[PDB]
């Protein structure tokens, strides 16, 4: 017995970390937060409907300004919209129709798209010629690109279905770092607010904390019974929320190394597609497969509002940087801007 001895050692180590996680669990968040006041019904009206795509929308990303948003649909078109005036600033024609992810640079100078083409293509919006052109096609991935997010204008972290995430230097076009450890297609990636750490959600039903500079996983979070389809970091960056196809969302803590609360209901049996917190981290919005989009209070797991405005699968969801609007994008080629009305 050669492989059996150290594989045993491996399950002994994982049991050790399990009892360490269990030992540090002083109390559950639900009882700790049972003394706080409930948010109550949250009514959001669709202030703007961004019509214009002619195919299912697979991803949307707000610009740092909180006014421009990029949207990617399988019509082969990536459109930058002006949310305030429902106008289309640009409509980039994608080389491949199959787009599964879209990103907006923190500066706003660039946007990126990825998909079954297996390449993340960076587009330079600010050009002297006056047209948006592909600056760099990052092509070193074996599997489809699931989510791509920019740290700077030169560095972008991309998640793929080859079970690996990679940090890319746009100028050279080479992966500075490759993150390996997932045994299943990575479907989602969220960076820390400080952009020092990122959490990746995969079909192996595990989410791993990775550090961009060290190059490898720091922590692994388990507890989902099905593939994680969406992941989002809490505003502080000490927590993240994961949405899976078992119709449940879980809040994990990077310091307690374990989950804290689970957001599920017997009325919902459709898997999550995209999640995102509010500005203060009190509202965890989640887009579901049943055409709806619940608004979970991320402190008591009490469902506090539903955004029912779509007729197909809600695929993307994003709250602005100032937290003053929520944009949902579903498979009926319509984006919708929501905000609370007083």
């Amino acid at each position: 017995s050669e492989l059996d001895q150290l594989r045993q050692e491996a399950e002994q180590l994982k049991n050790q970390i399990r009892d360490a996680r269990k030992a540090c669990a002083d109390a559950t968040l639900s009882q700790i937060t049972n003394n706080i006041d409930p948010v109550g019904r949250i009514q959001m009206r669709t202030r703007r409907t961004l019509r214009g795509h002619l195919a299912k929308i697979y991803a949307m990303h707000w610009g740092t300004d909180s006014r421009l948003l990029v949207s990617a649909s399988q019509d082969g078109k990536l459109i930058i919209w002006d949310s305030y005036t429902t106008n289309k600033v640009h409509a980039i024609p994608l080389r491949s129709s199959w787009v599964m992810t879209c990103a907006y640079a923190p500066s706003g100078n660039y946007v990126a798209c990825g998909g079954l083409d297996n390449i993340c293509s960076i587009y330079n919006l600010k050009t002297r010629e006056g047209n948006v052109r592909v600056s760099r096609e990052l092509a070193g991935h074996t599997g489809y690109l699931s989510c791509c997010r920019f740290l700077d204008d030169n560095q972008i972290v991309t998640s793929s279905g080859d079970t690996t995430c990679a940090l890319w230097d746009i100028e050279t076009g080479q992966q500075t770092t490759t993150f390996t450890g997932h045994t299943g297609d990575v479907m989602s990636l969220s960076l820390a607010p400080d952009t020092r750490l990122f959490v990746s959600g995969a079909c192996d039903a595990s989410a791993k904390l990775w550090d961009v500079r060290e190059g490898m996983c720091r922590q692994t979070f388990t507890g989902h019974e099905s593939d994680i389809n969406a992941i989002c970091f809490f505003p502080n960056g000490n927590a993240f929320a994961t949405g899976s196809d078992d119709a449940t969302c879980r809040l994990f803590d990077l310091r307690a190394d374990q989950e804290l609360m689970t957001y599920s209901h017997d009325n919902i049996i459709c898997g999550i597609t995209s999640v995102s917190f509010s500005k203060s981290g009190r509202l965890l919005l989640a887009g579901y497969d049943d055409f709806n989009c619940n608004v979970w209070d991320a402190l008591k797991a009490d469902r506090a509002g539903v955004l029912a405005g779509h007729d197909n699968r809600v695929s993307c969801l994003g709250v602005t940087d100032d937290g003053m609007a929520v944009a949902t994008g579903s498979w009926d080629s319509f984006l919708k801007i929501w905000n609370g009305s007083s």
Epitope: R67, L68, D82, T85, N87, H90, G108, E129, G130, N131
Partner: single-chain antibody, 232 residues
Framework: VQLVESGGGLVQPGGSRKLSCSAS????????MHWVRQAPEKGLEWVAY????????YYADTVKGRFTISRDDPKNTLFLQMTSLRSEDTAMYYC??????????????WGQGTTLTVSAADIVMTQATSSVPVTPGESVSISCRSS???????????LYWFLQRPGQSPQLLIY???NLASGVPDRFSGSGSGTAFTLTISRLEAEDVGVYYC?????????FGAGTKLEL
């Protein structure tokens, strides 16, 4: 980017002349194009504007009806045919770029210019000539005033600042009263409060000499300033 122009010169009064603006180096089919003219020993003055795809066309009331404007985007050329040229239409005509989306900077690149020598209400902007004998290393503030509040309800303040070197075409310094144009040094700055605007230069060098113009952009009848000239 390059905007070369052809046609224009000695025109007998009461005649006609067509001016061509050949655009090469950018997507001409997606740029709104304006024509601006500058009378000799005088400031600039707007002439005409044609939107992308010729969808919307405007003219200045001085030349409205007498002038016509059209673009040929398959060959990337903008045209201006003038009829019944009087003695007041003698000026250097500039063919400028302009693109209008959120965050865009209109009036990016100005044309070379062609001299026109014909022989034998609205918003007005006021700025004194103020030929200041400046020296390299002086902080200068250039102020122009508007008859109306330039600040629109959406938040923008459609004031544009232009700089024209002696013997060269104008360029964009600051657009919307606070946004610096891409290409100019950081030393330029601007501010305002709806009226009585100013442009501030902190590290004035020997290159920042010429005539400074300020322009409104709320309504299409457009008006420049008198032009502040900096020497020495």
């Amino acid at each position: 980017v390059q905007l070369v122009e052809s046609g224009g010169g000695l025109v007998q009064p009461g005649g006609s002349r067509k001016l061509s603006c050949s655009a090469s180096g950018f997507a001409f089919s997606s740029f709104g194009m304006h024509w601006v003219r500058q009378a000799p020993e005088k400031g600039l003055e707007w002439v005409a504007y044609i939107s992308s795809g010729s969808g919307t066309i405007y003219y200045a009331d001085t030349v409205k009806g007498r002038f016509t404007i059209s673009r040929d985007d398959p060959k990337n050329t903008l045209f201006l045919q003038m009829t019944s040229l009087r003695s007041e239409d003698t000026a250097m005509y500039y063919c400028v770029r302009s693109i209008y989306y959120y965050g865009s900077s209109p009036f990016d690149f100005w044309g070379q210019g062609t001299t026109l020598t014909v022989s034998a209400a609205d918003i007005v902007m006021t700025q004194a000539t103020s030929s200041v004998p400046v020296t390299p290393g002086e902080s200068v503030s250039i102020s122009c005033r508007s008859s109306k509040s330039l600040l629109h309800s959406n938040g923008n303040t459609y004031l544009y600042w232009f700089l024209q070197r002696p013997g060269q075409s104008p360029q964009l310094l600051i657009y919307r009263m606070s946004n610096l144009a891409s290409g100019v040094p950081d030393r330029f700055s601007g501010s305002g409060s709806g009226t009585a605007f100013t442009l501030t230069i902190s590290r004035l060098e020997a290159e920042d000499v010429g005539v400074y113009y300020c322009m409104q952009h709320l309504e299409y009848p457009l008006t420049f300033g008198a032009g502040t000239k900096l020497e020495l």
